[PDB]
C-alpha cells in the first residue's frame, strides 16, 4: 500500500489544465498585481494535499473485504522498520515527532478522544456515552475553534521564519576561515535580541555541518555563551547544585546609575593591533581561575 | 467582535506621511480636516476640467 | 579543496559512499571523546588568497 | 550605522508608500549587514599597513596602524631632557598628527563603501521609480480628501520631470545586452583583433573577463544582466504575511509607514534649516496660519 | 595557515600557563617529521611565569637527549599553551627547549626556522590535514599503512568506497538529516514549567492523572454538575474542565490557542 | 519592567482565549465584569 | 572633593551645577578637568 | 619564522643549571642545610608576594598604575600658588527661599555645640533636645527621634523634613542617600538642626520601615562582623536591600555592606528599607 | 559533572525512605519506577573525572 | 590575619625613588608581557564579568519525558488501598 | 567505556591506543554479533592517527573474523550469507526452493528509485535518450548450498 | 543668528525637567524621544 | 465573586519575600518572611501553594495560642500580608537603581561602544543620510501608450484585468476572461 | 561560603504541582510593543 501510494509518483496523475488556466496561471506567477486570487495553488502543494489524504483515507481491517491491510499486518511493518533502524535513521524519525506529535500532544483534549481513535479506525468502551459527550461539547463552539488540524497555525515573530533559516546565511563564507567569523559579524544580520541571535547562530553552524556531511564544534555553544557558560559555573560553585542558574538565585545587589563608567570609558579609550585581537573568543579570561572554569569540560584540554 | 473590528479598520484605514500643514496626521497639537472643513471644500469646488 | 573536503565526509560516515549501503551506526573514536575537536568543520582555505 | 539606515529606512517606507510592497525585515537587516562586513574587510586589510605621523622636525616619531593604534615610537635625546608634561604633548601631538594621515586614508575608504551600497541599492530605488505608475506632486501643493490641490504661483516653475521613455520600453537590461553586443563587435573586429593582442587588451581580458575564470578561482564565472526588481510587479512580503496571519501584516505595515513619516520629518527638518540660514525663515513660529486653520 | 613550496606555514603564539608571557612566530612549517615540536633554549626563560599554582614556573622540568632536530643536549618543558591562527582550541604543548650548540636554527637571517610537529597537529583540526587527501599526508613517514603515490579514490576505494556523496537513491541525502530546528522565542513560544516535589530540579514536570484517589470524587462532581465551581483536590490533576489539559511543555504563551 | 506588556495576541477574541484555557469561563456569574474574559488559567476553589 | 561641582540627580535626570561664586564662575584646570569628567560620567549614564 | 617579542634570536649564551651542570659542590651539612632553609622561605616569600597582588583592592591598583605614570626622575619641590585654591567651597544655597541659612565655614569659630547653640536662624523655629520626664521613661538619643522623625514624614508625605543634627545622624542621611532611600541632604551648619528631602515613588515612600537599633542611650549594641553577614545572606542569595548603618571605631558611619567588605564590627545605630 | 547526592531514590535504604521494609531485588521495583537493573561495579566503567 | 590582629606598626630623595621607572620609557630586561595581561594589571582592560551574562538558553530540547507510572496512576481504585499504597511512591 | 577509560586515565592508560586494545574490541564486536558497530569501527580506526603513523594495524586476524561476522548477520536491503531459507515461506514467496530477494529486480527498482527521486527535487526528469539500456549483465543471482 | 534653538522664560525650570522625568516611565528611544521632545516644545520653543 | 473581585498576583521573579513583612489584619499580626523551604499552618501553607511561592515562611499571631483565632482570620492575615509585599524591582526602581539581575541587557551596547574603533566608527564624507525632494516626477502615460509597451520585456497584453494600472481594466482581455467577471457577478 | 544548596531548598507538598520561571516572568516576554513600535 506504502509503495502504491506514497512512494510511487509516477503513477499519480494530475487533472490536466486547460489552455486559459496555464495561461492566467503563468502570468499570475511571473507577475504579481494585487487584488487578485489568493489561491493560485502550487502543483507541488496540491500533490502534498493528496498524499496527505491518501493517509487520511486509509482505513484497516479485513482486506478480503474493502480496505488494503490487516491493522496486525501495519504494526508487523511497523515492528520490522523500527527495529530496522540506523542512527541516524531513528534521529530523523524522532525529529519528525518532535515536530508533529510533540505539539499535539500537549494541545489534546478529551473532547477529541473520539477523533483521536478515528485515526486507526478502533471501536472504544463507550463509544456512544462519549458521542453524546463530545456532541454537547463541541456543540459549544465553531467546528474550526475544535479541530486538531489547525491548533498549531500560528506563531510569534513572523519576521524570521525557521524555513527560511534553513539554509545557513554566508555559510560560503565562514566555512572556509571560520575563525575570521565571530558571531558579531553575522549577528548584524538578525534584528532580534542578543540571547536569540545567539542561539540562532549555533542552530545555523549545526545545520550547515549536517548539510555538508562533517561533524560539528560542539564547542561552539559554549563559545558564543561563554559570559553565561562562566556565569553557570560559578553558580553552581556557590550555590551547591547540578543545573542552569535562573533569575530568582541571583544576586539581590543595587548598582548605582553610573555604575558602569569605569568599564564605559575602559571600552571606549581601548585599541587593537588586528581585528582578531578585538574579537578573539578567550578575551573573556584573565586568571589562571577563568581557564580553569571555562576548560573543565574537556579533560583534554 | 465589534471590538477588533474597529481595532482592523481604524490600523488599516490610517493616513501616514506629512500632510499640508507640514505635520503626521496624528501629531498632538496641530490638527487637520477640523469638522470636515475639507470635505465642504471639495463639495463646493468639485473635480472637473 | 573537494578532495580534502571528499577525505573528510568519507572518515565521517563510509555508507553515505556506497552504492548498497550497510548499516551505520556509531561506534567509539580513537582521539578521545572530544575528539570533535580535531576534526570538525569543512576544509579551511589558505588565509594569504 | 547611521547614514547607512537613514538611507534604508528611506527605501523601505519609500517602497511601502509609492507600491503596496513591504520589504522583508530579513532583507533590511541584511542589506545593513552587507554595509558593515564591507566595513570590516577594508579594516583586515588596513591593519596589514602602517601611518607615520612625526612631530618637531623630525625628532618624534609616531609609528601607528590608521585604526589608531601605536606601534613604535622614536625619540630624539634631545626631546628626553624637556619636562615629562611637555614630553607627553610631544608624542601625543605627533600621534594626533599619524591619525589625521590615517583618517583622511580612511575616509576615502569609506567613500568607496558608500559608492559601493549604493550600486547595491539601485536596482530597489531604481525599481520603485522606474514604473509607468510611479509620480509625485510637489511638495507646496495643498492635500484634500479627493487629490491634491494645484499650486497656484509662476505657472512656468512648475516642471514635470520624466524618467521613462514614453514609447516602447528600454530596460537598464537591453542596455547591458548592448553593451556586449559592442565588446563583441569590437573583438572580432581586425583592429580589434590586433588590439586584443596588447597590453591594454589583456588588461581587459583579465578585469573583465569571467568567462575564462578557471574553475575554483574566487569571483562570478558569468556576465550577470543587471537586477531587475519592478516594485509594483513584484510581490514581496504582504502576501505572505497575508496568508499567514494578519497581525504580522498589520505590524509590519505600520513599521513601514512609521519610518515613511520619520523620514519626510527628518527631511522637514533639514529643509526648515536651510531656510533659516539663508534668512528666508525666521526663529520662532511667525505664521501660525499656517498651522493652526486646517 | 598558507601554502608555498609545497608545504604548510602557520601563524602562532606561544604562551605560558597563566598567560601572563607570549611569543608571536609568524612563519612555521608544520612538519609531521617531530614527535615532538621544538624551541630555542632561550625562550625557557622569557616564558616562565611563576604563579601560584606553579610556584617555578613550570610543572615538567627535565633533561632528554633530543638528537632527533640534529647525554642530555636538551630541556623538555611543560606546560606552555600554543595558539594557532586557524583553530579555536588551545593546543598544549612539553616542548624541546635547545640550546645553540645541540641544534642552531639562524637559518636565513633574521629567520629562526621554527616548526611544529606531531605534538601540536593531534590536537588541531590540523588532524585532519593528515588523513589521505589532506595537505599533509605526502609528508606522513613511509609506513606499510600509509600508501605514497596512490590517487585519492583509489585509495577510498580500496577503504570501500563506491560512488559519490548519497548518489544512491537508497541513502538518505545528507541535507535532510535535520529539517526543522527548534527555536522558542521564534515560533510557539516558551513551555508552562511547573512541578511536583521539593523543586524545579528535585521533582518530576507531571501532575498526578485522574486514576489517583483523592481525585475521583472531585472529577465526579465537575462531570456532573459542570457549569458550578467545584471544591476539592481535583484541580492538581492533570485532567480538568477546560480544553486546554495540565501536562508538560503547554506553550501558554502561543497566539493559538 | 514594572509594568510588562503580557500576553497580546488578538488572533482569538479574549471569550475564546478565555474559553479555551480556563475552566473560569463554565461559570460566567461568579466573575466580576473587569475579570470577566481576561482570565487564562485553571482555578481552585477551598471552602474555608 | 574641593565641593567646586555639585549634582542633583531625579530617577531619570542630571543636574550638574557649577559653584564658584567668589572668581564668578571661572574654571580652574583642576576644576575643568574634573567637570570633563562629570559631565561625560553623568552623560554616559544608563538612565539618564 | 620570523619571531615577535622574543628580543636578540637564541637570547645570549645561557644554559640551564641541570643541563649545563657543573660538578656538584660538596657542601657541610651546614651548607646543604641553610641553602634548603633560605630557598624554602624564599619561595614562602614569593607566594606572600604573589597572594598580596591577588588580594588588593582596584582603588590601590589604580593609584598605583597612576603614580607610577606621572613618576619623574627628580623629586620636584611643590610650586607656590596663589593666596588659596584649596579653601573647601562653600555649598550653595539660595538665601531668599531658605530652610536655613547656609553658614559660612570661615564662621567656625562662632558656631556651638549640639547642646548650646549659637544664636542663629532666628526666623525659623528651633527644634528642642528631647529628655526624658521621669525614671522609667526611655532615655531618648538623637538616632531615635531622627529615625521617627523621617518616619512620621513620610506618613504624612511631606517633602522635607527638619531633623537633629549630630555626627552619626548626618553620617545616616549621607548612608542612605548612597543607597537612594532619600532624595536629598543638607547641613547647613546649623548647630540644632539640618534637613533632608525625601523621596516618593508610585504613590507611596521609599522608605518601608525605618527603626532605630536602641530604645535608650543607656543600652549600646555591638555588630560582630559575622552578624552583619548574616544579614546579607538570604538562605543563600546576597541581599543588599535592607540597609543597617552602624558606628566604627574609627568614627565612621557605614552601611553593614562596606563593614564587612573591611570585616570591621561596629555600634549598631538603625536599619532601614 | 554532577556529584552523587545522598538521600535520594536509589541511595536511601528501605526504613529511612519508606517506614517499610521494602525487598531490594534487582528486577522491576515499581516504587522506584525502574524497569530492570545490571548492577555493574560503581565507578569501573565511568571516566575517572567524572 | 584581619582587624582584630596585633597592629604591624609604621627634603631630599629616598631609595625607593631610584627603582622606581617611567613607563614611558623601556625598562630593564624586555620581558615579552603578553598585551592583554598588562592592560589587565594596570585596570585598564575592559571587563567581562559574571554581571554581563544573560540567561543560559536551552539550545537542543531534550526528548520528550513520558508519564512515568506511579503508584497513584492505576486503573483500578483498588490497587491504590489503605493497606497497600502509602503513597505514589 | 573501556575504550574511552584507556586513554583517560592518568594512573593505568596509555598514551596512544596498543594494538592489544584495538583487535580486543572488535573481537567484543564480533562475539555481540554488533554488525553497525563492527563496520564504523574498522573505518575509524583506518581513519585514525595511530594507523597512519603505523602503531596500530588491520592484521589478517581481524580482517578475516571481521568478514565472518560481516557473513554471518542480517543485512539492511540484502540477504546475506548465512541466511537460512525457509521451506514454508512459500505461503506467501510462491517458492519453496530460491531465496526471497531477485537481485535483479532490486537494481531496477533502484533505477526506478532514482527517476523518482531526481522528480521529488526538481520537479521534473530528463528523458532518457533511445540508445540508453540497463546493463544487467553483471548481476548473477542467489545460489543455495 | 541661529546659535541655538531653545529658550525660557519659567522659574526654576531646573526643578520642573527634574520632576517632569521623574514621572517618565521607559528607557526605549521612541519614548526618549517622545518626552523629551515634548518638554522641549512645550516650554524652551516659543510657540505661544 | 467577592474572591475574584479581590484578587491579587504575586512576582514570582523571587519566589518568597526578600524581606520580612510585619503587617496585621485586624487584631491578627502576621509575619512573612523568607525561609529555606515553606513552612506555615497547614491552611496559610496551601494559601501560599495557591501562590506558587517555594521559599516563603509564615506565622500568625506569636504563639499559635493567641487571640484572636478564627478560620477567617487564618485566611486574612495571610492574604493580607502578601498584599503588602513589595517586589525586588519595584524596591530597584524605587531607590532609583539598577538591579545587579537586568544589567546583562546593557552589555551589546558595552560591547560595540569596544568595538567602534576603526572603520565602524567612520561615516561617509560629505553624506548625511537627509536626501530632500528637489524635482517632481511622474512617468504615468496614457492607456493605449501602455498597452504594448511592456511587450518586449513580458508578454503582451501585460496589464490586463489590473484594475489599479489601468484606467480601462478590460482592455487587451480575451472574451472568455471578460465573461468570467460577469460570470462571478452574476 | 552558603552552605545551604539551591540544589535542595523547598518543601514537598505531595500532589500540589507550583510553577516557576525558567528566566524571568513571562508577562514580560514578548516585547513586541516597542519592536513593532505600537506605542502612543
Ligand atoms: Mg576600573
Ligand atoms: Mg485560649
Not at chain 8, 531668599?96 to 532666628?122: C, E, M, N, W
Not at chain 9, 525512605?17 to 537493573?37: C, G, L, N, S
Not at chain 13, 486574612?76 to 541587557?105: C, D, M, Q, T, W
Not at chain 13, 501585460?158 to 482592455?171: K, V, W
Request: aromatic share 10%; net charge positive; charged share 30%.
Amino acid at each position: 500500500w506504502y509503495l502504491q501510494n506514497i512512494l510511487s509518483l509516477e503513477l499519480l496523475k494530475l487533472k490536466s489544465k486547460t489552455n486559459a488556466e496555464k495561461i492566467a496561471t503563468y502570468r499570475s506567477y511571473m507577475r504579481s498585481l494585487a487584488s487578485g486570487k489568493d489561491n493560485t495553488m502550487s502543483d507541488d502543494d496540491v500533490i502534498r494535499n493528496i498524499i496527505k489524504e491518501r493517509w487520511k483515507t486509509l482505513e484497516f481491517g479485513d482486506r478480503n473485504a474493502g480496505y488494503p491491510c490487516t491493522f496486525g499486518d501495519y504494526i508487523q511493518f511497523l515492528n520490522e522498520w523500527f527495529k530496522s533502524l540506523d542512527e541516524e535513521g531513528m534521529q530523523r524519525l524522532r525529529e519528525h515527532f518532535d515536530r508533529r506529535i510533540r505539539p499535539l500532544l500537549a494541545v489534546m483534549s478529551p473532547v477529541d478522544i473520539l477523533w483521536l481513535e478515528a485515526l486507526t479506525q478502533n471501536s472504544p468502551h463507550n463509544k456512544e456515552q462519549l458521542q453524546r459527550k463530545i456532541a454537547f461539547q463541541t456543540s459549544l463552539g465553531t467546528p474550526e475553534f475544535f479541530d486538531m488540524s489547525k491548533r498549531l497555525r500560528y506563531e510569534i515573530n513572523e519576521d524570521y521564519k525557521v524555513r527560511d533559516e534553513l539554509g545557513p546565511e554566508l555559510f560560503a563564507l565562514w566555512s572556509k576561515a571560520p575563525e575570521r567569523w565571530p558571531p558579531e559579524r553575522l549577528s548584524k544580520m538578525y534584528g532580534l535580541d542578543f540571547t536569540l541571535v545567539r542561539k540562532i547562530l549555533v542552530w545555523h553552524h549545526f545545520k550547515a555541518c549536517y548539510d555538508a556531511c562533517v561533524e560539528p564544534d560542539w564547542s561552539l555553544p559554549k563559545r558564543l555563551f561563554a559570559l553565561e557558560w562562566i556565569r553557570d559555573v560559578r553558580a553552581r560553585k556557590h550555590g551547591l547544585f547540578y543545573g542552569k542558574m535562573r533569575f530568582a538565585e541571583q544576586k539581590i545587589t543595587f548598582y548605582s546609575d553610573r555604575f558602569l563608567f569605569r568599564d564605559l570609558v575602559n571600552r571606549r579609550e581601548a585599541s587593537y593591533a588586528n581585528v582578531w585581537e578585538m574579537d578573539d573568543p578567550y578575551r573573556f579570561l584573565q586568571t589562571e581561575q577563568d581557564y580553569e572554569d571555562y576548560w573543565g569540560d574537556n579533560y583534554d584540554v | 467582535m465589534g471590538e477588533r473590528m474597529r481595532a482592523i479598520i481604524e490600523d488599516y484605514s490610517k493616513g501616514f506621511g506629512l500632510g499640508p500643514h507640514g505635520h503626521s496626521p496624528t501629531h498632538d497639537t496641530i490638527h487637520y480636516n477640523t469638522l470636515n472643513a475639507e470635505g465642504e471644500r471639495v463639495r463646493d469646488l468639485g473635480y472637473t476640467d | 579543496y573537494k578532495d580534502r573536503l571528499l577525505s573528510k565526509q568519507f572518515f565521517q560516515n563510509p555508507q553515505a559512499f556506497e552504492v548498497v549501503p550497510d548499516r551505520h551506526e556509531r561506534s567509539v573514536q580513537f582521539g578521545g571523546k572530544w575528539e570533535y575537536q580535531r576534526t570538525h568543520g569543512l576544509p579551511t582555505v589558505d588565509r594569504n588568497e | 550605522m547611521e547614514v547607512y539606515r537613514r538611507i534604508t529606512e528611506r527605501v523601505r517606507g519609500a517602497l511601502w508608500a509609492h507600491h503596496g510592497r513591504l520589504m522583508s525585515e530579513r532583507q533590511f537587516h541584511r542589506i545593513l549587514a552587507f554595509v558593515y562586513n564591507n566595513k570590516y574587510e577594508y579594516q583586515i586589510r588596513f591593519d596589514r599597513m602602517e601611518v607615520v605621523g612625526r612631530e618637531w622636525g623630525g625628532r618624534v616619531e609616531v609609528v601607528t596602524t590608521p585604526a589608531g593604534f601605536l606601534k613604535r615610537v622614536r625619540v630624539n635625546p634631545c626631546v628626553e631632557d624637556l619636562t615629562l608634561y611637555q614630553q607627553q604633548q610631544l608624542i601625543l601631538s605627533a600621534y594626533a598628527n599619524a591619525c589625521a594621515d590615517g583618517r583622511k586614508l580612511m575616509e576615502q575608504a569609506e567613500m568607496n563603501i558608500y559608492k559601493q551600497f549604493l550600486k547595491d541599492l539601485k536596482p530597489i530605488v531604481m525599481g520603485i521609480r522606474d514604473n509607468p505608475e510611479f509620480y509625485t506632486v510637489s511638495e507646496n501643493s495643498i492635500e484634500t480628501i479627493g487629490g491634491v490641490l494645484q499650486t497656484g504661483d509662476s505657472n512656468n516653475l512648475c516642471h514635470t520631470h520624466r524618467t521613462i521613455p514614453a514609447a516602447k520600453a528600454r530596460q537598464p537590461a537591453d542596455e547591458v545586452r548592448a553593451r556586449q553586443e559592442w565588446e563583441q563587435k569590437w573583438i572580432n573586429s581586425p583592429r580589434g583583433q590586433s588590439w586584443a593582442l596588447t597590453l591594454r587588451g589583456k588588461t581587459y581580458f583579465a578585469l573583465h573577463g569571467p568567462q575564462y575564470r578557471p574553475r575554483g578561482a574566487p569571483g562570478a564565472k558569468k556576465e550577470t544582466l543587471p537586477l531587475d526588481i519592478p516594485a509594483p510587479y513584484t510581490a514581496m512580503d504582504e502576501k505572505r504575511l497575508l496568508k499567514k496571519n494578519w497581525m504580522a501584516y498589520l505590524d509590519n505595515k505600520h513599521v513601514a509607514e512609521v519610518m515613511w513619516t520619520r523620514v519626510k520629518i527628518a527631511d522637514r527638518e533639514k529643509r526648515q534649516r536651510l531656510l533659516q540660514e539663508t534668512g528666508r525663515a525666521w526663529h520662532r513660529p511667525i505664521n501660525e496660519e499656517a498651522i493652526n486653520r486646517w | 595557515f598558507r601554502m608555498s613550496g609545497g608545504d604548510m606555514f602557520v601563524e602562532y603564539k606561544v604562551l605560558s600557563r597563566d598567560h601572563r608571557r607570549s611569543i608571536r612566530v609568524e612563519d612555521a612549517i608544520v612538519d609531521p617529521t617531530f614527535k615532538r615540536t621544538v624551541l630555542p633554549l632561550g625562550w625557557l626563560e622569557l616564558l616562565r611565569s611563576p604563579s601560584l599554582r606553579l610556584p617555578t614556573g613550570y610543572f615538567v622540568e627535565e633533561t632528554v637527549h633530543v638528537s632527533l632536530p640534529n647525554e642530555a643536549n636538551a630541556i623538555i618543558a611543560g606546560p606552555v599553551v600554543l595558539y594557532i591562527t586557524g583553530q579555536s582550541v588551545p593546543v598544549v604543548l612539553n616542548p624541546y627547549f635547545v640550546p645553540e650548540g645541540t641544534w642552531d636554527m639562524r637559518t636565513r637571517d633574521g629567520e629562526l626556522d621554527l616548526r611544529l610537529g606531531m605534538d601540536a597537529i593531534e590536537q588541531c583540526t590540523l588532524f585532519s590535514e593528515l588523513r589521505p587527501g589532506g595537505l599533509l599526508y605526502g609528508k606522513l613517514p613511509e609506513n606499510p599503512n600509509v600508501r605514497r603515490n596512490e590517487s585519492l579514490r583509489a585509495t577510498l576505494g580500496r577503504y570501500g568506497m563506491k560512488c559519490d556523496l548519497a548518489e544512491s537513491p537508497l541513502v538518505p541525502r545528507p541535507w535532510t538529516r535535520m529539517r526543522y530546528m527548534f527555536i522558542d522565542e521564534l515560533q510557539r513560544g516558551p513551555k508552562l514549567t511547573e512541578f511536583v516535589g521539593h523543586n524545579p530540579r528535585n521533582g518530576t514536570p507531571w501532575r498526578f492523572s485522574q486514576n489517583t484517589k483523592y481525585f475521583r470524587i472531585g472529577i465526579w462532581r465537575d462531570t456532573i454538575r459542570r457549569n458550578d465551581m467545584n471544591e476539592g483536590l481535583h484541580a492538581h490533576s492533570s485532567w480538568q474542565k477546560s480544553p486546554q489539559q495540565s501536562v508538560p511543555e503547554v506553550r501558554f504563551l502561543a497566539p493559538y490557542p | 519592567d514594572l509594568y510588562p506588556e503580557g500576553f497580546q495576541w488578538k488572533h482569538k477574541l479574549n471569550t475564546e482565549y478565555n474559553q479555551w484555557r480556563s475552566n473560569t469561563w463554565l461559570t460566567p456569574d461568579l466573575i466580576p465584569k473587569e475579570h470577566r474574559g481576561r482570565f487564562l488559567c485553571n482555578f481552585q476553589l477551598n471552602i474555608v | 572633593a574641593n565641593r567646586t561641582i555639585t549634582g542633583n540627580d531625579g530617577r531619570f535626570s542630571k543636574t550638574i551645577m557649577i559653584n564658584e561664586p567668589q572668581c564668578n564662575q571661572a574654571l580652574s584646570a583642576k576644576t575643568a578637568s574634573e567637570l570633563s569628567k562629570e559631565i561625560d560620567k553623568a552623560t554616559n549614564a544608563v538612565y539618564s | 619564522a620570523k619571531v615577535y617579542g622574543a628580543v636578540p634570536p637564541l637570547g645570549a649564551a645561557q644554559g640551564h643549571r641541570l643541563l649545563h651542570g657543573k660538578r656538584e659542590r660538596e657542601g657541610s651539612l651546614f651548607a646543604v642545610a641553610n641553602d634548603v632553609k633560605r630557598d624554602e622561605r624564599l619561595l614562602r616569600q614569593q607566594l606572600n608576594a604573589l597572594l598580596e597582588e591577588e588580594r588588593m583592592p582596584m582603588q590601590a591598583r589604580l593609584q598605583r598604575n597612576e603614580a607610577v605614570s606621572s613618576h619623574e626622575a627628580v623629586p620636584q619641590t611643590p610650586l607656590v600658588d596663589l593666596p588659596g585654591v584649596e579653601r573647601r567651597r562653600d555649598l550653595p544655597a539660595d538665601p531668599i527661599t531658605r530652610l536655613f541659612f547656609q553658614h559660612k565655614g570661615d564662621h567656625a569659630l562662632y558656631y556651638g555645640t549640639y547642646d548650646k547653640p549659637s544664636v542663629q536662624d532666628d526666623d525659623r523655629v528651633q527644634i528642642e533636645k528631647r529628655v526624658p520626664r521621669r525614671r522609667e521613661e526611655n532615655l531618648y538619643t538623637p538616632i531615635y527621634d531622627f529615625c521617627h522623625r523621617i518616619r512620621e514624614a513620610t506618613e504624612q508625605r511631606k517633602r522635607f523634613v527638619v531633623v537633629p543634627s549630630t555626627i552619626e545622624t548626618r553620617g545616616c542621611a549621607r548612608v542612605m542617600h548612597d543607597h537612594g532611600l532619600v532624595a536629598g541632604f543638607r547641613d547647613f551648619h546649623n548647630d540644632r538642626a539640618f534637613a533632608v528631602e525625601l523621596k516618593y515613588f508610585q504613590g507611596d515612600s521609599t522608605i518601608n520601615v525605618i527603626e532605630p537599633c536602641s530604645y535608650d542611650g543607656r543600652t549600646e549594641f555591638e555588630w560582630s562582623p559575622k552578624m552583619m553577614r548574616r544579614l546579607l545572606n538570604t538562605h543563600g542569595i546576597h541581599n543588599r536591600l535592607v540597609v543597617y548603618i552602624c558606628r566604627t571605631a574609627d568614627n565612621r558611619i557605614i552601611d553593614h555592606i562596606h563593614a564587612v567588605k573591611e570585616n570591621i564590627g561596629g555600634r549598631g545605630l538603625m536599619m532601614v528599607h | 559533572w554532577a556529584p552523587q547526592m545522598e538521600w535520594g531514590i536509589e541511595n536511601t535504604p528501605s526504613q529511612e525512605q519508606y517506614q517499610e521494609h521494602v525487598p531490594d531485588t534487582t528486577d522491576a521495583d515499581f516504587r522506584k519506577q525502574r524497569r530492570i537493573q545490571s548492577r555493574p561495579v560503581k565507578w569501573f566503567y565511568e571516566s575517572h573525572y567524572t | 590575619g584581619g582587624p582584630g590582629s596585633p597592629v604591624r606598626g609604621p627634603r631630599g630623595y629616598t631609595a625607593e625613588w631610584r627603582d622606581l621607572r617611567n613607563p614611558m620609557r623601556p625598562p630593564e630586561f624586555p620581558t615579552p608581557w603578553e598585551r592583554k595581561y598588562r592592560q589587565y594589571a594596570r585596570g585598564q582592560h575592559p571587563s567581562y564579568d559574571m554581571v554581563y551574562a544573560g540567561p543560559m538558553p536551552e539550545i537542543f530540547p531534550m526528548r520528550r519525558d513520558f508519564r512515568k507510572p506511579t503508584r497513584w496512576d492505576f486503573h483500578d481504585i483498588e490497587k491504590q488501598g489503605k493497606y497497600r499504597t502509602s503513597g505514589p511512591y | 567505556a573501556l575504550w574511552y577509560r584507556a586513554t583517560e586515565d592518568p594512573y593505568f592508560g596509555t598514551p596512544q591506543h596498543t594494538q592489544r586494545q584495538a583487535e580486543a574490541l572488535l573481537k567484543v564486536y564480533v562475539q555481540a554479533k554488533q554488525r553497525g558497530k563492527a563496520i564504523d569501527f574498522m573505518n575509524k580506526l583506518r581513519g585514525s592517527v595511530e594507523y597512519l603513523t603505523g602503531d596500530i594495524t588491520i592484521t589478517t586476524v581481524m580482517q578475516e573474523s571481521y568478514d565472518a561476522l560481516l557473513d554471518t548477520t542480517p543485512h539492511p536491503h540484502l540477504l546475506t550469507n548465512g541466511f537460512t531459507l525457509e521451506s514454508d515461506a512459500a505461503k506467501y514467496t510462491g517458492e519453496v526452493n530460491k531465496a526471497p530477494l531477485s537481485p535483479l529486480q532490486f537494481r531496477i527498482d533502484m533505477e526506478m528509485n532514482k527517476y523518482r527521486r531526481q522528480q521529488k527535487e526538481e520537479g521534473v526528469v530528463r528523458v532518457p535518450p533511445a540508445l540508453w539500456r540497463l546493463d544487467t549483465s553483471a548481476i548473477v543471482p542467489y545460489k543455495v548450498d | 543668528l541661529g546659535w541655538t534653538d531653545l529658550f525660557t522664560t519659567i522659574p526654576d525650570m531646573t526643578y520642573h525637567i527634574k520632576e517632569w522625568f521623574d514621572t517618565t516611565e521607559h528607557m526605549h528611544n521612541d519614548a526618549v524621544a517622545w518626552q523629551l521632545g515634548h518638554l522641549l516644545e512645550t516650554c524652551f520653543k516659543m510657540k505661544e | 465573586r467577592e474572591a475574584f473581585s479581590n484578587i491579587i498576583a504575586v512576582d514570582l521573579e523571587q519566589e518568597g519575600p526578600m524581606y520580612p513583612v510585619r503587617v496585621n489584619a485586624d487584631g491578627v499580626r502576621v509575619l512573612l518572611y523568607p525561609a529555606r523551604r515553606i513552612v506555615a499552618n497547614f491552611r496559610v501553607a496551601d494559601i501560599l501553594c495557591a501562590f506558587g511561592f517555594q521559599h516563603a515562611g509564615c506565622r500568625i499571631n506569636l504563639k499559635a495560642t493567641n487571640n484572636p483565632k478564627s478560620p477567617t482570620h487564618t485566611v486574612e492575615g495571610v492574604f493580607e500580608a502578601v498584599k503588602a509585599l513589595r517586589s525586588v524591582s519595584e524596591i530597584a526602581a524605587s531607590r532609583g537603581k539598577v538591579p545587579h539581575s537586568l544589567i546583562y541587557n546593557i552589555y551589546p551596547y558595552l560591547e560595540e561602544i569596544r568595538r567602534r574603533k576603526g572603520m565602524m566608527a567612520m561615516h561617509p564624507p560629505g553624506k548625511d543620510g537627509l536626501l530632500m525632494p528637489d524635482r517632481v516626477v511622474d512617468n504615468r502615460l496614457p492607456d493605449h501608450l501602455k498597452r504594448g509597451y511592456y511587450d518586449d520585456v513580458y508578454w503582451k497584453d501585460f496589464f490586463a484585468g489590473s484594475d489599479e494600472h489601468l484606467n480601462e481594466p478590460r482592455m487587451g482581455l480575451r472574451g472568455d476572461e471578460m465573461r468570467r467577471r460577469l460570470e462571478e457577478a452574476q | 561560603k552558603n552552605l545551604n544548596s539551591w540544589y535542595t531548598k523547598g518543601t514537598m507538598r505531595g500532589g500540589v504541582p507550583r510553577i516557576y520561571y525558567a528566566w524571568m516572568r513571562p508577562g514580560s516576554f514578548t516585547r513586541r510593543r516597542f519592536e513593532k513600535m505600537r506605542n502612543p
